[PDB]
Design a protein around this motif. Structure first.
Motif, PDB file in Angstrom:
ATOM      1  N   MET A 128       0.861  -1.188   0.000  1.00 37.57           N
ATOM      2  CA  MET A 128       0.000   0.000   0.000  1.00 37.57           C
ATOM      3  C   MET A 128       0.893   1.232   0.000  1.00 37.57           C
ATOM      4  SD  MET A 128      -3.752  -0.437   1.477  1.00 37.57           S
ATOM      5  CE  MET A 128      -3.527  -0.187   3.257  1.00 37.57           C
ATOM      6  N   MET A 129       0.521   2.232  -0.806  1.00 41.94           N
ATOM      7  CA  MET A 129       1.258   3.481  -0.972  1.00 41.94           C
ATOM      8  C   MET A 129       0.590   4.657  -0.249  1.00 41.94           C
ATOM      9  SD  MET A 129       0.778   6.211  -3.539  1.00 41.94           S
ATOM     10  CE  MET A 129       1.504   7.777  -3.018  1.00 41.94           C
ATOM     11  N   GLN A 130      -0.403   5.311  -0.862  1.00 43.63           N
ATOM     12  CA  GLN A 130      -1.170   6.481  -0.418  1.00 43.63           C
ATOM     13  C   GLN A 130      -1.431   6.552   1.096  1.00 43.63           C
ATOM     14  OE1 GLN A 130      -1.757   8.656  -3.141  1.00 43.63           O
ATOM     15  NE2 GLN A 130      -3.604   9.810  -2.784  1.00 43.63           N
ATOM     16  N   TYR A 131      -0.468   7.091   1.847  1.00 49.39           N
ATOM     17  CA  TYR A 131      -0.558   7.226   3.295  1.00 49.39           C
ATOM     18  C   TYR A 131      -1.622   8.255   3.682  1.00 49.39           C
ATOM     19  CZ  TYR A 131       3.571   4.313   4.335  1.00 49.39           C
ATOM     20  OH  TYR A 131       4.404   3.244   4.451  1.00 49.39           O
ATOM     21  N   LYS A 132      -2.043   8.208   4.947  1.00 49.52           N
ATOM     22  CA  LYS A 132      -3.037   9.106   5.518  1.00 49.52           C
ATOM     23  C   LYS A 132      -2.614   9.464   6.937  1.00 49.52           C
ATOM     24  CE  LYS A 132      -7.209   9.200   4.220  1.00 49.52           C
ATOM     25  NZ  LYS A 132      -8.655   9.230   3.952  1.00 49.52           N
ATOM     26  N   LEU A 133      -3.194  10.537   7.458  1.00 44.80           N
ATOM     27  CA  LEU A 133      -2.990  11.079   8.789  1.00 44.80           C
ATOM     28  C   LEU A 133      -4.355  11.364   9.386  1.00 44.80           C
ATOM     29  CD1 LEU A 133      -1.086  12.301  10.964  1.00 44.80           C
ATOM     30  CD2 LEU A 133      -1.299  14.482   9.722  1.00 44.80           C
ATOM     31  N   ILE A 134      -4.486  11.232  10.704  1.00 44.89           N
ATOM     32  CA  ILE A 134      -5.688  11.486  11.480  1.00 44.89           C
ATOM     33  C   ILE A 134      -5.239  12.229  12.745  1.00 44.89           C
ATOM     34  CG2 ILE A 134      -7.453  10.373  12.923  1.00 44.89           C
ATOM     35  CD1 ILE A 134      -7.350   8.024  10.833  1.00 44.89           C
ATOM     36  N   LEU A 135      -5.642  13.480  12.918  1.00 36.03           N
ATOM     37  CA  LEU A 135      -5.318  14.273  14.077  1.00 36.03           C
ATOM     38  C   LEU A 135      -6.386  13.905  15.110  1.00 36.03           C
ATOM     39  CD1 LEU A 135      -4.122  17.604  12.435  1.00 36.03           C
ATOM     40  CD2 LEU A 135      -2.881  15.415  12.813  1.00 36.03           C
ATOM     41  N   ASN A 136      -6.044  13.194  16.194  1.00 39.84           N
ATOM     42  CA  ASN A 136      -6.951  12.746  17.265  1.00 39.84           C
ATOM     43  C   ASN A 136      -6.908  13.732  18.445  1.00 39.84           C
ATOM     44  OD1 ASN A 136      -8.226  10.398  16.179  1.00 39.84           O
ATOM     45  ND2 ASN A 136      -7.417   9.043  17.744  1.00 39.84           N
ATOM     46  N   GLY A 137      -7.012  15.024  18.146  1.00 41.06           N
ATOM     47  CA  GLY A 137      -6.945  16.082  19.126  1.00 41.06           C
ATOM     48  C   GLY A 137      -8.041  16.021  20.158  1.00 41.06           C
ATOM     49  N   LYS A 138      -7.677  16.397  21.376  1.00 36.81           N
ATOM     50  CA  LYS A 138      -8.563  16.460  22.529  1.00 36.81           C
ATOM     51  C   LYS A 138      -9.312  17.798  22.488  1.00 36.81           C
ATOM     52  CE  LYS A 138      -6.405  12.661  24.036  1.00 36.81           C
ATOM     53  NZ  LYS A 138      -6.228  12.672  25.506  1.00 36.81           N
ATOM     54  N   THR A 139      -9.377  18.438  21.318  1.00 34.71           N
ATOM     55  CA  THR A 139     -10.020  19.717  21.102  1.00 34.71           C
ATOM     56  C   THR A 139     -10.803  19.640  19.791  1.00 34.71           C
ATOM     57  OG1 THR A 139      -7.928  20.472  20.134  1.00 34.71           O
ATOM     58  CG2 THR A 139      -8.264  21.020  22.443  1.00 34.71           C
ATOM     59  N   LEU A 140     -10.108  19.318  18.695  1.00 32.37           N
ATOM     60  CA  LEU A 140     -10.606  19.203  17.344  1.00 32.37           C
ATOM     61  C   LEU A 140      -9.776  18.147  16.620  1.00 32.37           C
ATOM     62  CD1 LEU A 140     -11.425  21.917  14.827  1.00 32.37           C
ATOM     63  CD2 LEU A 140      -9.453  20.506  14.325  1.00 32.37           C
ATOM     64  N   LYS A 141     -10.422  17.347  15.771  1.00 30.50           N
ATOM     65  CA  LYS A 141      -9.796  16.294  14.979  1.00 30.50           C
ATOM     66  C   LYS A 141      -9.725  16.698  13.510  1.00 30.50           C
ATOM     67  CE  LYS A 141     -12.495  13.749  17.381  1.00 30.50           C
ATOM     68  NZ  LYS A 141     -12.333  12.310  17.672  1.00 30.50           N
ATOM     69  N   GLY A 142      -8.949  15.944  12.734  1.00 29.29           N
ATOM     70  CA  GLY A 142      -8.753  16.195  11.320  1.00 29.29           C
ATOM     71  C   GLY A 142      -8.053  15.061  10.625  1.00 29.29           C
ATOM     72  N   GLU A 143      -7.845  15.149   9.316  1.00 32.61           N
ATOM     73  CA  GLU A 143      -7.168  14.166   8.516  1.00 32.61           C
ATOM     74  C   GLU A 143      -6.500  14.810   7.304  1.00 32.61           C
ATOM     75  OE1 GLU A 143     -10.948  13.897   8.935  1.00 32.61           O
ATOM     76  OE2 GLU A 143     -10.584  12.727  10.765  1.00 32.61           O
ATOM     77  N   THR A 144      -5.583  14.103   6.644  1.00 29.08           N
ATOM     78  CA  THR A 144      -4.913  14.559   5.422  1.00 29.08           C
ATOM     79  C   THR A 144      -4.348  13.342   4.698  1.00 29.08           C
ATOM     80  OG1 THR A 144      -3.195  16.026   4.442  1.00 29.08           O
ATOM     81  CG2 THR A 144      -2.783  15.309   6.655  1.00 29.08           C
ATOM     82  N   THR A 145      -4.208  13.471   3.384  1.00 28.29           N
ATOM     83  CA  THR A 145      -3.670  12.465   2.481  1.00 28.29           C
ATOM     84  C   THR A 145      -2.352  13.036   1.935  1.00 28.29           C
ATOM     85  OG1 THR A 145      -6.011  12.068   1.946  1.00 28.29           O
ATOM     86  CG2 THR A 145      -4.449  10.825   0.677  1.00 28.29           C
ATOM     87  N   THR A 146      -1.614  12.254   1.152  1.00 29.93           N
ATOM     88  CA  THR A 146      -0.359  12.654   0.548  1.00 29.93           C
ATOM     89  C   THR A 146      -0.035  11.662  -0.569  1.00 29.93           C
ATOM     90  OG1 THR A 146       1.955  13.218   1.059  1.00 29.93           O
ATOM     91  CG2 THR A 146       1.078  11.339   2.238  1.00 29.93           C
ATOM     92  N   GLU A 147       0.948  12.032  -1.383  1.00 32.04           N
ATOM     93  CA  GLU A 147       1.486  11.287  -2.498  1.00 32.04           C
ATOM     94  C   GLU A 147       2.801  10.617  -2.067  1.00 32.04           C
ATOM     95  OE1 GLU A 147       2.399  15.535  -4.383  1.00 32.04           O
ATOM     96  OE2 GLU A 147       2.496  13.949  -5.895  1.00 32.04           O
ATOM     97  N   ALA A 148       3.194  10.749  -0.792  1.00 34.22           N
ATOM     98  CA  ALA A 148       4.403  10.140  -0.263  1.00 34.22           C
ATOM     99  C   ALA A 148       4.233   8.625  -0.363  1.00 34.22           C
ATOM    100  CB  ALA A 148       4.606  10.536   1.199  1.00 34.22           C
ATOM    101  N   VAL A 149       5.264   7.923  -0.815  1.00 35.12           N
ATOM    102  CA  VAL A 149       5.222   6.476  -0.980  1.00 35.12           C
ATOM    103  C   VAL A 149       5.906   5.716   0.163  1.00 35.12           C
ATOM    104  CG1 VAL A 149       7.229   6.553  -2.572  1.00 35.12           C
ATOM    105  CG2 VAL A 149       5.610   4.674  -2.785  1.00 35.12           C
TER     106      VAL A 149
END
Length: 57
Positions: free
Chosen positions: A1-22
């Motif tokens: 699997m290539m297309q990595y992801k991020l999930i901000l599990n903040g104790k205030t506000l959460k978020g996510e992001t994708t990238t082309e990093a392999v």
């Protein structure tokens, strides 16, 4: 699997992001900046099935 992801599990506000990093190293550098801007660069979780990093504050 290539297309990595991020999930901000903040104790205030959460978020996510994708990238082309392999590779985890390149993605870590990309996601670091994203969380360092969001004020959440703390811990960096690890995974082997989902290949998704998450911040832990």
């Amino acid at each position: 699997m290539m297309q990595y992801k991020l999930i901000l599990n903040g104790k205030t506000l959460k978020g996510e992001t994708t990238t082309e990093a392999v590779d985890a190293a390149t993605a870590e550098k990309v996601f670091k900046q994203y969380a360092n801007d969001n004020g959440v660069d703390g811990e960096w979780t690890y995974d082997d099935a989902t290949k998704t990093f998450t911040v832990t504050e």
